[PDB]
Design a protein around this ligand. Structure first.
Ligand SMILES: Nc1ccn([C@H]2CC[C@@H](COP(=O)(O)OP(=O)(O)OP(=O)(O)O)O2)c(=O)n1
Ligand SMILES: [Ca+2]
Length: 341
DNA sequence: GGGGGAAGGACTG
DNA sequence: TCAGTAGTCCTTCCCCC
């Protein structure tokens, strides 16, 4: 099994670079401005010129501005990046019938039936980087290995504008050396739960009784790491089917006044319905992020498709429910729709 | 025991 | 006033068989 993983480099910012060439070379910081105060908000993606100085996704806009005060700060333009992404994904479709779009900038290709070895597999990923570059002027990084996970890990090592193959040999090496925290799907939370169990490398999962692990991080993540450690991971490339579509927003100020929150909720509904396009959801979920950044939610599943009007009146009921059951003020409010007809 | 949902959680990053 | 968005998978808890 030969998996070829494609990951677009600092995508949001790179697109801005393509639509405005005079930006390349200089630090570009694509941000999400909340409007709670000057430059309130967060960095969503920065290019390499910026990242080399510590300005990257997640940090506060105001912090970025302290480090790189003369960088070009741009507001997020999601729809624009989504259309560019659609065209590039279509380019990838032309190299394999088995494709798995994982996000707006990541796709796995099962080229097991397209190449004989990693040499051909390397040349194909070479052809792809040149195809995308030719038509969209977007650089991407290619990862190649025996399974999706290691294909991705490869791409993370080669970034940016890179390409790398991790053969059966290197896989065994990584299983022993690789900091398990660098394994896709393992965040800070799960990593710490591991150090405390004396597991810092994929291999270390083979030296501890299953239940001890399956009891610390859960059965799924257990069977996941173990399978990777034993070099038995082989999840197939599955054609992605969007299962949910939503929208969440930050309010100018925290609140718990149903009438002050409503405008933000309805806006989220309108945007969600525009993005549902033809898809009829049967389940709605209202999601609130409280003042202390905790996450709270209430949803409902109807035995029929949810019209916009039902969305409006039902979301209000779900928001009221949250307010009654939780006394904290809300900071972000949004809605997610799922279970499509 | 485990299905099915809801809600929470984690990671996507 | 440092803390954005989007989507998936998983777990927990409960109902229920
Ligand atoms: N706190 C974070 C961390 C990451 N991301 C998103 C946007 C950038 C991306 C980084 O993940 P990679 O797959 O490594 O991509 P990249 O080439 O490093 O960056 P980009 O996604 O911008 O191309 O994920 C985010 O929104 N918020
Ligand atoms: Ca990327």
């Amino acid at each position: 099994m030969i998996v070829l993983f494609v990951d677009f480099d600092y995508f949001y910012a790179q697109v801005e670079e393509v639509l405005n060439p005079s930006l390349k070379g200089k630090p570009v910081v694509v941000c999400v401005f909340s409007g709670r105060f000057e430059d309130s908000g967060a960095v969503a993606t920065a290019n390499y010129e910026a990242r080399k100085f510590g300005v990257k996704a997640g940090i506060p806009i105001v912090e970025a501005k302290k480090i790189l005060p003369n960088a070009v700060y741009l507001p997020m333009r999601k729809e624009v990046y989504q259309q560019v992404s659609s065209r590039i994904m279509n380019l990838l479709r032309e190299y394999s019938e088995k494709i798995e779009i994982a996000s707006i900038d990541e796709a796995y290709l099962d080229i097991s039936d397209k190449v004989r070895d990693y040499r051909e597999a390397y040349n194909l990923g070479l052809e792809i980087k040149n195809k995308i570059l030719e038509k969209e002027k977007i650089t991407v990084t290619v990862g190649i290995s025996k399974n999706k996970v290691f294909a991705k890990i490869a791409a993370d090592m080669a970034k940016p504008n890179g390409i790398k193959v991790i053969d059966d040999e290197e896989v065994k090496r990584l299983i022993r050396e690789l900091d398990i925290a660098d394994v896709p799907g393992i965040g800070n939370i799960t990593a710490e739960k591991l150090k405390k169990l004396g597991i810092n490398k994929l291999v270390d999962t083979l030296s501890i009784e299953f239940d001890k692990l399956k009891g610390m991080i859960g059965e799924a993540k257990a069977k996941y790491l173990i399978s990777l450690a034993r070099d038995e991971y082989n999840e197939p490339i599955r054609t992605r089917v969007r299962k949910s579509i939503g929208r969440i927003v930050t309010m100018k100020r925290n609140s718990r006044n149903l009438e002050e929150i409503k405008p933000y909720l309805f806006r989220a509904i309108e945007e969600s319905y525009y993005k549902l396009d033809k898809r009829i959801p049967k389940a709605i979920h209202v999601v609130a992020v409280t003042e202390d950044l905790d996450i709270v939610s209430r949803g409902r599943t109807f035995p029929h498709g949810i019209s916009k009007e039902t969305a409006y009146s039902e979301s209000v009921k779900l928001l009221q429910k949250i307010l009654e059951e939780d006394e904290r003020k809300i900071r972000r409010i949004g809605v997610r729709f799922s279970k499509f007809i």
